[PDB]
Design an enzyme around this catalytic site. Structure first.
Site, PDB file in Angstrom:
ATOM      1  N   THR A   8      -5.480 -19.336   1.093  1.00 28.69           N
ATOM      2  CA  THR A   8      -4.811 -20.659   1.079  1.00 28.69           C
ATOM      3  C   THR A   8      -4.983 -21.388   2.416  1.00 28.69           C
ATOM      4  O   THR A   8      -5.349 -20.783   3.383  1.00 28.69           O
ATOM      5  CB  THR A   8      -3.263 -20.508   0.736  1.00 28.69           C
ATOM      6  N   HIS A  68      -1.196 -12.767  -2.270  1.00 27.74           N
ATOM      7  CA  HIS A  68      -2.326 -13.283  -1.506  1.00 27.74           C
ATOM      8  C   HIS A  68      -2.131 -14.726  -1.019  1.00 27.74           C
ATOM      9  O   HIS A  68      -2.935 -15.254  -0.258  1.00 27.74           O
ATOM     10  CB  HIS A  68      -3.619 -13.156  -2.331  1.00 27.74           C
ATOM     11  N   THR A  69      -1.018 -15.340  -1.420  1.00 26.65           N
ATOM     12  CA  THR A  69      -0.646 -16.630  -0.824  1.00 26.65           C
ATOM     13  C   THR A  69      -0.391 -16.561   0.707  1.00 26.65           C
ATOM     14  O   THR A  69      -0.442 -17.589   1.389  1.00 26.65           O
ATOM     15  CB  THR A  69       0.511 -17.255  -1.575  1.00 26.65           C
ATOM     16  N   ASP A  92       4.046 -19.538  -0.924  1.00 29.37           N
ATOM     17  CA  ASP A  92       4.199 -20.585  -1.929  1.00 29.37           C
ATOM     18  C   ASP A  92       3.260 -20.285  -3.094  1.00 29.37           C
ATOM     19  O   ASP A  92       2.638 -19.211  -3.118  1.00 29.37           O
ATOM     20  CB  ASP A  92       3.944 -21.992  -1.359  1.00 29.37           C
ATOM     21  N   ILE A 135       2.617 -19.272   4.932  1.00 30.54           N
ATOM     22  CA  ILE A 135       3.638 -19.915   4.116  1.00 30.54           C
ATOM     23  C   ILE A 135       3.589 -19.328   2.723  1.00 30.54           C
ATOM     24  O   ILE A 135       2.551 -19.449   2.049  1.00 30.54           O
ATOM     25  CB  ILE A 135       3.414 -21.464   4.006  1.00 30.54           C
ATOM     26  N   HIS A 189       0.809  -1.190   0.000  1.00 33.82           N
ATOM     27  CA  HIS A 189       0.000   0.000   0.000  1.00 33.82           C
ATOM     28  C   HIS A 189       0.853   1.255   0.000  1.00 33.82           C
ATOM     29  O   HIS A 189       0.406   2.297  -0.519  1.00 33.82           O
ATOM     30  CB  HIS A 189      -0.973  -0.029   1.182  1.00 33.82           C
ATOM     31  N   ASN A 205      -2.524 -22.547   3.946  1.00 38.39           N
ATOM     32  CA  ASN A 205      -1.340 -22.251   4.741  1.00 38.39           C
ATOM     33  C   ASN A 205      -0.953 -20.780   4.696  1.00 38.39           C
ATOM     34  O   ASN A 205       0.035 -20.439   4.067  1.00 38.39           O
ATOM     35  CB  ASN A 205      -0.155 -23.173   4.315  1.00 38.39           C
TER      36      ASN A 205
END
Ligand code: HEM
Ligand code: HEM
Lengths: 248, 248
Positions: free
Chosen positions: B179, B162-163, B186, B184, B41, B181
């Site tokens: 996700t 966004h993972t 990935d 994490i 942001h 996780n």
């Protein structure tokens, strides 16, 4: 520093014809003050450092109309739309600036020179660039000087634009005319500013700020003493204002 | 196209020491996602055409904190303030970008290169430049492409940010992690995006827009198949993002 563009002979002819139609319309409708406010709010969003905002037709955008500062300028736009439809060749940018020049002329003010050629731009500036009536001399210099790029002399002379029109409690919340003759363009704004408060007449904190500033005050004095000098400096400042970001 | 400034040896030493303190802090506090949101942001308000906005420390301003898009980033700023006080020589601009690079590293993502030297600037950009979750591919291109100046590849790879993390119904109104996780880093975001909706997991309309675009979609596919390729393109895009308007 201005290099004005070439517009076609047909463009020039529509300027001259719209100028005349605007005199008759604005005089009959008694809307000079509102029209001068539309032209100033259109122009006064210019930020010299990024070259955004300024008199480029964007005030007709619902989004710029939404700006709180633009309270009731939707009326101005509405009033001009039928007339504008008669001159489809002119840019809204030019037409609004021409309405501002005409508003000053038909109320008895100086003849502000006008040059056509402003293009209608797609994006309105961000909200919040217009000055705040409750603030003082530093704020006026931020707004007219640091953003628009006008001089200290221009600030005082342009404030004399308040010689016509009135505030409204349903728009800004302030209420009433600055002068006893609010459809007559003269130096009365400065005369009334100096003489203090009088029943029925308005002074914003931004107007009073001119009285206590070491540079603004002698200009207030000069203009209250000499309407011819006011008129010369007013026409110079309005011209620059109406041309911000245009033909540089 | 980047020419990075020279910073003193003491400045470099504080970067290295703050990097380490940031790993331990962000890992213990479980705030990587929030910190990556603060860095994005901070950076994502850059407008290439006027060279305003961008990663220059202004997100700590109450005025930028006020932006609705910045819902809960006041928490991020608060969490970092004690740590920042330990490194008074660093600009807030640098410190926030370094927190974003660290957030990606400590959750297992790529090592995004970092160059110091951003200066803390006095004026926050106008509100409204960050993307809108309810809009689609044209809007993403306006925002990342026309304003920030990033490529179509950068848009897809950066969406993979966004993972980690989650939406919150009291902040944006969306709710939940992308996700299984969410601490994490990935390629799971792309895997989940492709496989459709699953109970407990979020997809914004802006995420789904990647699926139907002729250029975005093959990138979604590539990243879901090859985490190494995602990581390479992510690090490239985050680096560019964190350097918008800086050292040009
Ligand atoms: C110095 C900074 C200025 C401030 C703080 C300011 C503020 C205001 C406010 C609060 C109003 C009342 C709006 C309403 O309630 O209807 C007003 C009206 C008006 N302003 Fe100013 N203004 C400034 C400069 C200017 C300039 C530069 C011009 C043009 C040269 C101008 C022309 C006018 C006119 C003609 C009106 C009356 C509009 C009407 O009668 O409906 N003002 N201004
Ligand atoms: C593609 C345009 C994007 C849109 C429309 C978007 C929208 C959103 C929204 C609505 C949220 C939820 C905020 C909340 O309710 O707490 C969110 C969270 C988040 N965003 Fe995005 N975002 C975009 C791009 C990015 C980018 C480029 C990054 C970083 C590379 C990023 C990183 C994050 C992270 C880490 C979170 C979770 C924050 C937390 O866990 O508190 N986003 N985003």
């Amino acid at each position: 520093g201005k290099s004005y563009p070439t517009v076609s002979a047909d463009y020039q002819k529509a300027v001259e014809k719209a100028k005349k139609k605007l005199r008759g319309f604005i005089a009959e409708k008694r809307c000079a003050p509102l029209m001068l406010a539309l032209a100033w709010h259109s122009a006064g969003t210019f930020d010299k450092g990024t070259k955004t905002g300024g008199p480029f037709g964007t005030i007709k955008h619902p989004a710029e109309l939404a700006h709180s500062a633009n309270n009731g300028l939707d009326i101005a736009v509405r009033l001009l739309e039928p007339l504008k439809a008669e001159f489809p060749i002119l840019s809204y940018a030019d037409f609004y600036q021409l309405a501002g020049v005409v508003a000053v002329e038909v109320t008895g003010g100086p003849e502000v020179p006008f040059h056509p050629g402003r293009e209608d731009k797609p994006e309105p500036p961000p909200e919040g660039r217009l000055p705040d009536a409750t603030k003082g001399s530093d704020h006026l210099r931020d707004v007219f000087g640091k953003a628009m790029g006008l001089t200290d002399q221009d600030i005082v002379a342009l404030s004399g634009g308040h010689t016509i029109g009135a505030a409204h409690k349903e728009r800004s919340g302030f209420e009433g005319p600055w002068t006893s003759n609010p459809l007559i363009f003269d130096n009365s704004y400065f005369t009334e500013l100096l003489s203090g408060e009088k029943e029925g007449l308005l002074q914003l904190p931004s107007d009073k700020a001119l009285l206590s500033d070491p540079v603004f005050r002698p200009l207030v004095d000069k203009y209250a003493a000499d309407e011819d000098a006011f008129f010369a400096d007013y026409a110079e400042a309005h011209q620059k204002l109406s041309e911000l970001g245009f033909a540089d």
